Swiss-Prot record, chain B:
The lineage of its organism: Eukaryota, Metazoa, Chordata, Craniata, Vertebrata. Part of the 40S ribosomal subunit. Part of the small subunit (SSU) processome, composed of more than 70 proteins and the RNA chaperone small nucleolar RNA (snoRNA) U3. A zinc finger (C4-type) spans 37-60. There is a cross-link at residues 23, 29 (Glycyl lysine isopeptide (Lys-Gly) (interchain with G-Cter in ubiquitin)). Monoubiquitinated at Lys-23 and Lys-29 by RNF25 in response to ribosome collisions (ribosome stalling): ubiquitination promotes subsequent activation of RNF14, leading to EEF1A1 ubiquitination and degradation and rescue of stalled ribosomes. Deubiquitination at Lys-29 by USP16 is required for maturation of the 40S ribosomal complex. The chain holds residues 85 to 151 of 156 of the full protein. The modification N6-acetyllysine is found at residues 20, 29. This is Small ribosomal subunit protein eS31. Component of the 40S subunit of the ribosome. Part of the small subunit (SSU) processome, first precursor of the small eukaryotic ribosomal subunit. During the assembly of the SSU processome in the nucleolus, many ribosome biogenesis factors, an RNA chaperone and ribosomal proteins associate with the nascent pre-rRNA and work in concert to generate RNA folding, modifications, rearrangements and cleavage as well as targeted degradation of pre-ribosomal RNA by the RNA exosome. It is found in: Cytoplasm; Nucleus, Nucleolus.
Curated annotation (Swiss-Prot), chain C:
GO terms for biological process: cytoplasmic translation; translation. It comes from the Eukaryota. It is linked to Diamond-Blackfan anemia 13: A form of Diamond-Blackfan anemia, a congenital non-regenerative hypoplastic anemia that usually presents early in infancy. Diamond-Blackfan anemia is characterized by a moderate to severe macrocytic anemia, erythroblastopenia, and an increased risk of malignancy. 30 to 40% of Diamond-Blackfan anemia patients present with short stature and congenital anomalies, the most frequent being craniofacial (Pierre-Robin syndrome and cleft palate), thumb and urogenital anomalies. The modification N6-acetyllysine is found at residue 47. It comes from Homo sapiens (Human). This is Small ribosomal subunit protein uS14. It is found in: Cytoplasm, Cytosol; Cytoplasm; Rough endoplasmic reticulum. Zn(2+) binds at residues 20, 23, 38, 41. One of its GO terms (molecular function) is structural constituent of ribosome. Its main location: cytoplasm. Belongs to the universal ribosomal protein uS14 family. The modification Omega-N-methylarginine is found at residue 11.
From Swiss-Prot, chain D:
It comes from the Eukaryota. GO terms for biological process: cytoplasmic translation; translation. Component of the small ribosomal subunit. The methylated form interacts with NPM1. This is Small ribosomal subunit protein eS10. Component of the 40S ribosomal subunit. The ribosome is a large ribonucleoprotein complex responsible for the synthesis of proteins in the cell. Belongs to the eukaryotic ribosomal protein eS10 family. Keywords: Cytoplasm, Diamond-Blackfan anemia, Isopeptide bond, Methylation, Nucleus, Phosphoprotein, Ribonucleoprotein, Ribosomal protein, Ubl conjugation. The modification Phosphotyrosine is found at residue 12. The chain holds residues 1 to 98 of 165 of the full protein.
Curated annotation (Swiss-Prot), chain E:
The lineage of its organism: Eukaryota, Metazoa, Chordata, Craniata, Vertebrata. Keywords: Acetylation, Cytoplasm, Isopeptide bond, Phosphoprotein, Ribonucleoprotein, Ribosomal protein, Ubl conjugation. The modification N6-acetyllysine is found at residues 19, 60. The modification Phosphoserine is found at residue 78. PANTHER family: 30S RIBOSOMAL PROTEIN S10 FAMILY MEMBER. GO terms for biological process: cytoplasmic translation; positive regulation of signal transduction by p53 class mediator; translation. Component of the 40S small ribosomal subunit. It comes from Homo sapiens. This is Small ribosomal subunit protein uS10. One of its GO terms (cellular component) is cytosol. It is found in: Cytoplasm.
Length: 130, 67, 55, 98, 104
RNA sequence: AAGGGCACCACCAGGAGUGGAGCCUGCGGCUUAAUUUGACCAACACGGGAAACCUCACCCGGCCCGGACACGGACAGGAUUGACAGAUUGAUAGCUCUUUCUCGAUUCCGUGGGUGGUGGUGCAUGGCCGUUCUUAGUUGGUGGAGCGAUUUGUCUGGUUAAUUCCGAUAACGAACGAGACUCUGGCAUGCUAACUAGUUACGCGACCCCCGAGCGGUCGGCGUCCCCCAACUUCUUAGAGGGACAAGUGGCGUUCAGCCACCCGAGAUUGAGCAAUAACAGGUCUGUGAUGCCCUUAGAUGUCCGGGGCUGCACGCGCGCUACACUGACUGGCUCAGCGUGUGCCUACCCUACGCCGGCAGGCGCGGGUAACCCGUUGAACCCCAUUCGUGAUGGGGAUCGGGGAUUGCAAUUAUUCCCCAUGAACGAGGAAUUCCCAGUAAGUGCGGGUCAUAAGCUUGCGUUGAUUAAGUCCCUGCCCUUUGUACACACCGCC
């Protein structure tokens, strides 16, 4: 109806929401092995799946970190209470996620490994992962 | 820079001593030497000022002059 | 200053009313389809939103 | 910051009701979208949050134009002693029904 | 009872849109619902043309971003009430549903 | 220097032009308190940069702290914060001054230390982007040659848009790029479907003919998914598919790779996107809560508010718009599109039918549309058909300039824009130079989107009308490969 926004604006808003959530999750969970986000939107309730490598680190003490993230997303995007749920999924064959290898190499460089050795280690690991 | 005006003065408060602006008589008679702001937000705790030509409420900002 | 003139200037329109939803920039905005996002920020998040280059 | 006691108390009690705080970066918003009944603006909200962050009671994350403060345990104790809450009530993020 | 239901399915990729049309039509046909033919509203092309450069220096090369929105819709017919007959949607992410009674 | 090949960012033959006039706009200069700044093929309608305020970074002034936190002072006998009145101010900034009220631990002062900055540095950087370069080029492994930098592979030749392929071969086997790929356009009376698309047919109508037709002619008039109360998908929409391969024929060619022509066919080269190794002290720190260092940080280079500037003009240049007219202008009639937008998280501002008022811009009521549903069957321009003009600076051109009326906005002056009546300036096809272009192309011609409270001479797209010349060359400008010479390697803008 007139209250509902047009199809074009609705799809652009969905894309904007995806991008904003992706940026927020990237900034918050970069050191936790975050790789990407997928959302299957249903009118009854929405679910947000976080693709991560260190999913046990993503899920805090008794799920405290995921509870905080869910509450933050709920407040920021104005979802009705209880209508948004966040789950975490471990990425299979993490060596093939080009994003995850980027933070791995960043971790090595921040630790202080020589750049040639770190890059060669990451390259060898990627090829070993296949 | 060399701005033509001198550095603007900043107001410092007078740092007045105890308020005590209401007196009792003959070993205690409740009496005000000031004025009361009659608004419902000023209340009875506050007191109007005693300027030379008007009275001013601290909260209600009401002014009563004599003409 | 105090409450009377700090934000007293009307900002109902013009470039001062509109800023990028990402970088808080006032130039190169894209208000088509209600994006409200900077020229370069759109190039950054186009594939994330769902905008692709077909031709 | 010159915020009054009531505004500070409301800001802290929202963090204790739930251990998160989302705030749009806008010092010219007349009211925070939540707790608008107390009539305190986003400027005071974000300044109280930066005081908490500098004192180590909250973790600050900043996406595009929003802050996403997460309450810590060091902040749990501080809010407990500041709000005089008994050592039995915890935020929903800290404990959900369990 | 008698009710009329129109289901509008709108998405960005024709593969998922066609799959979510086909399975709905198949289920309704199996339940012998009278299915009005799958009609295809003309596709919407959201086109944005910006400058590739971020600084305005260069040979003025323009970037052309497209967004294709595809819209199909179905009409369900039965002498019996239809919501109790079909309650699930059996969709996949990327598509949006819109159920509407003919009163509106 | 030679040999071979290639390109409308080269030429040829041509078209339209630009350079000449006016004007819009962007650079330099001059002026200025400031006229913010970057950039000099690959800068100059570029920074999506159409700036009244904001923007804003510049200039003249004035406020605020939005200086976390730690420590030390001060303090409920008061740390400190606001304030009506008068003076003051551009200001109804309690900014400051007189006056006292008022809040109460939130602050204030000092020392460290934050934080912010469209502040410096793009010659510190990331990312992005442009360019070398859209040319066809680039690289390992093992083997061969060389003491080695290196070389072969990566080639005599033919062919190709292409180190594309055929072949020769101390190379063999590969990898990238090219190609392949994705989107778009052209064809499917074949399939699937369609009240948010229609076409036929039928029934009601309305008008003409009526001599006499009558299954006559027109209807964007109403109906037959207002569910029993028609069918169909040609037109429209969009999916699955098919379809074109140098496949068939003739000739040329080692008869190889391929080339030319022809038939059938909608189509025998449709346009784009993407795009290698290596690099540039190319551009951006004025896109970013990308960023190192440096500067500033309370009389601020933070931020806010008021005003001005970014437009300012002896002049030079670039992109364009309008023209110089009769293949035209004016007046009227008739007649045809396709892209695509449309009511706002913040955020206030949508597209508009219809009726009335006004000459116009507009105004006033009623709707419809979050959209194949309403604007809208987008009654567009050019073009077409009639009228007047008559080779003149003329009814060409509309610059400049006066007066009046509206609309947007808080505000229109240095005219925001629009309307009306007056003024009709240069300009009679433009030197040297120089740009772009090969088929639905150039060009004429309008319409959308972006910017947008107000807006296009810009740009990005769309349609409409629609050609001349050419199917070549290395002459100029360059590019690729081979050989060659070199005292160059910051690589000929070299060196000396
Ligand atoms: Mg005339």
């Amino acid at each position: 109806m007139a209250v509902q926004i047009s199809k074009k604006r609705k799809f652009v808003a969905d894309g904007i929401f995806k991008a904003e959530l992706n940026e927020f999750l990237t900034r918050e969970l970069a050191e936790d092995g975050y790789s990407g986000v997928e959302v299957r939107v249903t009118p009854t309730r929405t679910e947000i799946i976080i693709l991560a490598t260190r999913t046990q680190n993503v899920l805090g003490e008794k799920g405290r970190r995921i509870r905080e993230l869910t509450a933050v997303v709920q407040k920021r995007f104005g979802f009705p209470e209880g209508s948004v749920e966040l789950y975490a999924e471990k990425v299979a064959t993490r060596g093939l996620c080009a994003i995850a290898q980027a933070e791995s190499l960043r971790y090595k460089l921040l630790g202080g490994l020589a750049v040639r050795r770190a890059c060669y280690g990451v390259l060898r690991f990627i090829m070993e992962s296949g | 820079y060399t701005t033509p005006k001198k550095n603007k003065h900043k107001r410092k408060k007078v740092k007045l001593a105890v308020l005590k602006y209401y007196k009792v008589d003959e070993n205690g008679k409740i009496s005000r030497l000031r004025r009361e702001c009659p608004s419902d937000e000023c209340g009875a705790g506050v007191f109007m000022a005693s300027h030379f030509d008007r009275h001013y409420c601290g909260k209600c900002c009401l002014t009563y002059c004599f003409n | 200053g105090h409450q009377q003139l700090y934000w007293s200037h009307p900002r109902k329109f013009g470039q001062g009313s509109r800023s990028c939803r990402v970088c808080s920039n006032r130039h190169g905005l894209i208000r088509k389809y209600g994006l409200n996002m900077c020229r370069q920020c759109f190039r950054q998040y186009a594939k994330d939103i769902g905008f692709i280059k077909l031709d | 910051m010159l915020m009054p006691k009531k505004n500070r108390i409301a800001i802290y009690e929202l963090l204790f009701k739930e251990g998160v705080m989302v705030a749009k970066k806008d010092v010219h918003m007349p009211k925070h979208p939540e707790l608008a009944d107390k009539n305190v603006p986003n400027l005071h909200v974000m300044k109280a949050m930066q005081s908490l962050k500098s004192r180590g009671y909250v973790k600050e994350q900043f996406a595009w134009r929003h802050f996403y403060w997460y309450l810590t345990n060091e902040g749990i104790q501080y809010l407990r002693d500041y709000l005089h809450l008994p050592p039995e009530i915890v935020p929903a993020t800290l404990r959900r029904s369990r | 009872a008698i009710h009329r239901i129109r289901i509008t399915l709108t998405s960005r990729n024709v593969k998922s849109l066609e799959k979510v049309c086909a399975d709905l039509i198949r289920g309704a046909k199996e339940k012998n619902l009278k299915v009005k033919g799958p009609v295809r509203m003309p596709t919407k092309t959201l086109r944005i043309t910006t400058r590739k450069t971020p600084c305005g220096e260069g040979s003025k090369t323009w970037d052309r971003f497209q967004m294709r929105i595809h819209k199909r819709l179905i009409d369900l017919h039965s002498p019996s009430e239809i919501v109790k007959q079909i309650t699930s949607i059996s969709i996949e992410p990327g598509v949006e549903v819109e159920v509407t009674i003919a009163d509106a």
